[PDB]
Design an enzyme around this catalytic site. Sequence first.
Site, PDB file in Angstrom:
ATOM      1  N   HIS A  69     -63.872  33.539 -11.148  1.00  0.00           N
ATOM      2  CA  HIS A  69     -64.321  33.158  -9.813  1.00  0.00           C
ATOM      3  C   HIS A  69     -65.790  32.712  -9.826  1.00  0.00           C
ATOM      4  O   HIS A  69     -66.159  31.805  -9.075  1.00  0.00           O
ATOM      5  CB  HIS A  69     -64.114  34.276  -8.783  1.00  0.00           C
ATOM      6  CG  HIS A  69     -62.708  34.373  -8.268  1.00  0.00           C
ATOM      7  ND1 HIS A  69     -62.067  33.302  -7.672  1.00  0.00           N
ATOM      8  CD2 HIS A  69     -61.859  35.424  -8.166  1.00  0.00           C
ATOM      9  CE1 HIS A  69     -60.858  33.664  -7.291  1.00  0.00           C
ATOM     10  NE2 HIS A  69     -60.698  34.958  -7.572  1.00  0.00           N
ATOM     11  N   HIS A  71     -60.236  37.241 -14.629  1.00  0.00           N
ATOM     12  CA  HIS A  71     -59.896  36.592 -13.367  1.00  0.00           C
ATOM     13  C   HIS A  71     -61.130  36.617 -12.461  1.00  0.00           C
ATOM     14  O   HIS A  71     -61.542  35.585 -11.900  1.00  0.00           O
ATOM     15  CB  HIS A  71     -58.677  37.251 -12.708  1.00  0.00           C
ATOM     16  CG  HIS A  71     -58.374  36.818 -11.303  1.00  0.00           C
ATOM     17  ND1 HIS A  71     -57.216  36.094 -10.976  1.00  0.00           N
ATOM     18  CD2 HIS A  71     -59.021  37.037 -10.146  1.00  0.00           C
ATOM     19  CE1 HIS A  71     -57.180  35.902  -9.679  1.00  0.00           C
ATOM     20  NE2 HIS A  71     -58.283  36.467  -9.144  1.00  0.00           N
ATOM     21  N   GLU A  72     -61.723  37.802 -12.345  1.00  0.00           N
ATOM     22  CA  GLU A  72     -62.866  37.969 -11.461  1.00  0.00           C
ATOM     23  C   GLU A  72     -64.051  37.123 -11.928  1.00  0.00           C
ATOM     24  O   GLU A  72     -64.689  36.462 -11.106  1.00  0.00           O
ATOM     25  CB  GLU A  72     -63.291  39.427 -11.306  1.00  0.00           C
ATOM     26  CG  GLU A  72     -62.210  40.378 -10.777  1.00  0.00           C
ATOM     27  CD  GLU A  72     -61.386  40.009  -9.546  1.00  0.00           C
ATOM     28  OE1 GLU A  72     -61.730  39.049  -8.886  1.00  0.00           O
ATOM     29  OE2 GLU A  72     -60.435  40.744  -9.240  1.00  0.00           O
ATOM     30  N   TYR A  79     -62.271  29.050  -0.267  1.00  0.00           N
ATOM     31  CA  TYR A  79     -61.261  30.071  -0.496  1.00  0.00           C
ATOM     32  C   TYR A  79     -60.308  30.156   0.701  1.00  0.00           C
ATOM     33  O   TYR A  79     -60.262  31.159   1.412  1.00  0.00           O
ATOM     34  CB  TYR A  79     -61.948  31.395  -0.850  1.00  0.00           C
ATOM     35  CG  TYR A  79     -61.074  32.387  -1.579  1.00  0.00           C
ATOM     36  CD1 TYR A  79     -60.637  32.147  -2.879  1.00  0.00           C
ATOM     37  CD2 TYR A  79     -60.697  33.582  -0.976  1.00  0.00           C
ATOM     38  CE1 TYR A  79     -59.857  33.069  -3.564  1.00  0.00           C
ATOM     39  CE2 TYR A  79     -59.927  34.522  -1.653  1.00  0.00           C
ATOM     40  CZ  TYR A  79     -59.522  34.271  -2.956  1.00  0.00           C
ATOM     41  OH  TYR A  79     -58.785  35.188  -3.651  1.00  0.00           O
ATOM     42  N   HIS A  84     -53.199  33.824  -2.685  1.00  0.00           N
ATOM     43  CA  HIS A  84     -52.608  34.545  -3.805  1.00  0.00           C
ATOM     44  C   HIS A  84     -51.094  34.359  -3.834  1.00  0.00           C
ATOM     45  O   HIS A  84     -50.417  34.977  -4.661  1.00  0.00           O
ATOM     46  CB  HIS A  84     -52.841  36.059  -3.708  1.00  0.00           C
ATOM     47  CG  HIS A  84     -54.281  36.460  -3.805  1.00  0.00           C
ATOM     48  ND1 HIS A  84     -55.057  36.668  -2.664  1.00  0.00           N
ATOM     49  CD2 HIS A  84     -55.069  36.745  -4.878  1.00  0.00           C
ATOM     50  CE1 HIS A  84     -56.288  37.024  -3.027  1.00  0.00           C
ATOM     51  NE2 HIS A  84     -56.324  37.098  -4.394  1.00  0.00           N
ATOM     52  N   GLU A 131     -57.649  30.526  -6.828  1.00  0.00           N
ATOM     53  CA  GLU A 131     -56.865  31.634  -7.370  1.00  0.00           C
ATOM     54  C   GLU A 131     -56.182  31.291  -8.694  1.00  0.00           C
ATOM     55  O   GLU A 131     -56.210  32.092  -9.626  1.00  0.00           O
ATOM     56  CB  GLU A 131     -55.833  32.105  -6.338  1.00  0.00           C
ATOM     57  CG  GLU A 131     -56.373  33.206  -5.462  1.00  0.00           C
ATOM     58  CD  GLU A 131     -56.936  34.361  -6.280  1.00  0.00           C
ATOM     59  OE1 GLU A 131     -56.198  34.930  -7.087  1.00  0.00           O
ATOM     60  OE2 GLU A 131     -58.124  34.689  -6.106  1.00  0.00           O
ATOM     61  N   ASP A 134     -53.636  36.247   4.174  1.00  0.00           N
ATOM     62  CA  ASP A 134     -54.156  36.042   2.821  1.00  0.00           C
ATOM     63  C   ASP A 134     -54.898  34.709   2.721  1.00  0.00           C
ATOM     64  O   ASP A 134     -54.683  33.935   1.784  1.00  0.00           O
ATOM     65  CB  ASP A 134     -53.040  36.229   1.788  1.00  0.00           C
ATOM     66  CG  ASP A 134     -53.453  36.016   0.345  1.00  0.00           C
ATOM     67  OD1 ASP A 134     -54.582  36.415  -0.012  1.00  0.00           O
ATOM     68  OD2 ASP A 134     -52.630  35.474  -0.437  1.00  0.00           O
TER      69      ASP A 134
HETATM   70  N1  LIG Z   1     -56.145  40.746  -5.966  1.00  0.00           N
HETATM   71  C1  LIG Z   1     -55.073  40.462  -5.020  1.00  0.00           C
HETATM   72  C2  LIG Z   1     -53.917  41.464  -5.178  1.00  0.00           C
HETATM   73  C3  LIG Z   1     -54.304  42.927  -5.036  1.00  0.00           C
HETATM   74  C4  LIG Z   1     -53.997  43.475  -3.667  1.00  0.00           C
HETATM   75  C5  LIG Z   1     -53.234  44.783  -3.708  1.00  0.00           C
HETATM   76  N2  LIG Z   1     -54.048  45.897  -3.157  1.00  0.00           N
HETATM   77  C6  LIG Z   1     -55.629  40.351  -3.594  1.00  0.00           C
HETATM   78  O1  LIG Z   1     -56.812  40.611  -3.304  1.00  0.00           O
HETATM   79  O2  LIG Z   1     -54.893  39.959  -2.671  1.00  0.00           O
HETATM   80 CL   LIG Z   2     -53.529  38.953   5.139  1.00  0.00          CL
HETATM   81 CL   LIG Z   3     -58.904  37.678  -6.146  1.00  0.00          CL
HETATM   82 ZN   LIG Z   4     -58.921  36.011  -7.369  1.00  0.00          ZN
END
Ligand SMILES: N[C@@H](CCCC[NH3+])C(=O)O
Ligand SMILES: [Cl-]
Ligand SMILES: [Cl-]
Ligand SMILES: [Zn+2]
Length: 316
Positions: free
Chosen positions: A146, A142-143, A157, A231, A166, A226
């Site tokens: 990106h 996943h990373e 983003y 996400h 995402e 977010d």
């Molecule tokens: N990777 C996601 C989920 C993980 C967050 C939970 N600590 C984010 O950055 O939102």
């Molecule tokens: Cl947030």
């Molecule tokens: Cl992420």
């Molecule tokens: Zn991501």
Amino acid sequence: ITGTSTVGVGRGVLGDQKNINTTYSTYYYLQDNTRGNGIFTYDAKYRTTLPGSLWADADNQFFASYDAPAVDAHYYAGVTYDYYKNVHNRLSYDGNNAAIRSSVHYSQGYNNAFWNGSQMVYGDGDGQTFIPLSGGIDVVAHELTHAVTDYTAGLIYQNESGAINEAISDIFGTLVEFYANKNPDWEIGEDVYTPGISGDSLRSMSDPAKYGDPDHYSKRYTGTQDNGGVHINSGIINKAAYLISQGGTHYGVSVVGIGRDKLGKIFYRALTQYLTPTSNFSQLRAAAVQSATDLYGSTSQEVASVKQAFDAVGVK
Ligand SMILES: N[C@@H](CCCC[NH3+])C(=O)O
Ligand SMILES: [Cl-]
Ligand SMILES: [Cl-]
Ligand SMILES: [Zn+2]
Ligand SMILES: [Ar]
Ligand SMILES: [Ar]
Ligand SMILES: [Ar]
Ligand SMILES: [Ar]
Ligand SMILES: [Ar]
Ligand SMILES: [Ar]
Ligand SMILES: [Ar]
Ligand SMILES: [Ar]
Ligand SMILES: [Ar]
Ligand SMILES: [Ar]
Ligand SMILES: [Ar]
Ligand SMILES: [Ar]
Ligand SMILES: [Ar]
Ligand SMILES: [Ar]
Ligand SMILES: [Ar]
Ligand SMILES: [Ar]
Ligand SMILES: [Ar]
Ligand SMILES: [Ar]
Ligand SMILES: [Ar]
Ligand SMILES: [Ar]
Ligand SMILES: [Ca+2]
Ligand SMILES: [Ca+2]
Ligand SMILES: [Ca+2]
Ligand SMILES: [Ca+2]
Ligand SMILES: [Cl-]
Ligand SMILES: [Cl-]
Ligand SMILES: [Cl-]
Ligand SMILES: [Cl-]
Ligand SMILES: [Cl-]
Ligand SMILES: [Cl-]
Ligand SMILES: [Cl-]
């Protein structure tokens, strides 16, 4: 470092043994010279200075519990490189063999991982919510996805473009998990999330609603948390990709699945040929339809399933 390529052995976060490509020069370093301009893994030593120290080891054996997160970041970076090269003929994330760099042991009790524009970074988790995040091949992939997005579409983003960004990372993270063929599924993060709870994960692509995420455009999150729900709204697109691959009926709209290889091909084409930094969900549908048309022809089952999937999730 300059040195000679060696092969070490160690144990990852989930306790499995694996070989890792190293480099010898006084110490053995987590430097894999076998892939592109190299894969390099660093120790952040519980701090947030990055990248920290290139990982050094006296004997080329990596079985210490402190070693595990490093083993997996390094090994699964290597798997992800292999996926992109063999499946998409893409050489590393920039398509020109850029070095892939990861740091582990980032901070203390850090319940996350990220691509920072230059490298991957993995927290060790707090032992309750997460165990070291590089333990999850879908997380690693996943990373690193990106980085691929940064070099290709460049999706911003935030809001819809951010949710596509995402989704791309969840889709290809999942496709890497399948490629490697260890306990693959359509969930995200299940290998490292809540060691105290079995059967759960951070997000689900087959049923986003399992974890509070929308599965239809009409249920999109429109507030500011977010980065505008990147996400959260990713569930709409994750659902569409799941349907394209696996098929199914969703709010009475039926989709004939066309399989993972074709999903991967269509979305990779869309990412690299059509999407732009500011693409919205409707533009993604257009990109995916046009990609499927390019690969299979305007009257194909593939094109039809793409259209049905986006219909099922309410994206016009
Ligand atoms: N990777 C996601 C989920 C993980 C967050 C939970 N600590 C984010 O950055 O939102
Ligand atoms: Cl947030
Ligand atoms: Cl992420
Ligand atoms: Zn991501
Ligand atoms: Ar670990
Ligand atoms: Ar291995
Ligand atoms: Ar090599
Ligand atoms: Ar690489
Ligand atoms: Ar290569
Ligand atoms: Ar070090
Ligand atoms: Ar060292
Ligand atoms: Ar060592
Ligand atoms: Ar060392
Ligand atoms: Ar890659
Ligand atoms: Ar996507
Ligand atoms: Ar876990
Ligand atoms: Ar959305
Ligand atoms: Ar349904
Ligand atoms: Ar239908
Ligand atoms: Ar498949
Ligand atoms: Ar895509
Ligand atoms: Ar991708
Ligand atoms: Ar743009
Ligand atoms: Ar169909
Ligand atoms: Ca050792
Ligand atoms: Ca799995
Ligand atoms: Ca998974
Ligand atoms: Ca769990
Ligand atoms: Cl030497
Ligand atoms: Cl393991
Ligand atoms: Cl130990
Ligand atoms: Cl490089
Ligand atoms: Cl594996
Ligand atoms: Cl959630
Ligand atoms: Cl259409």
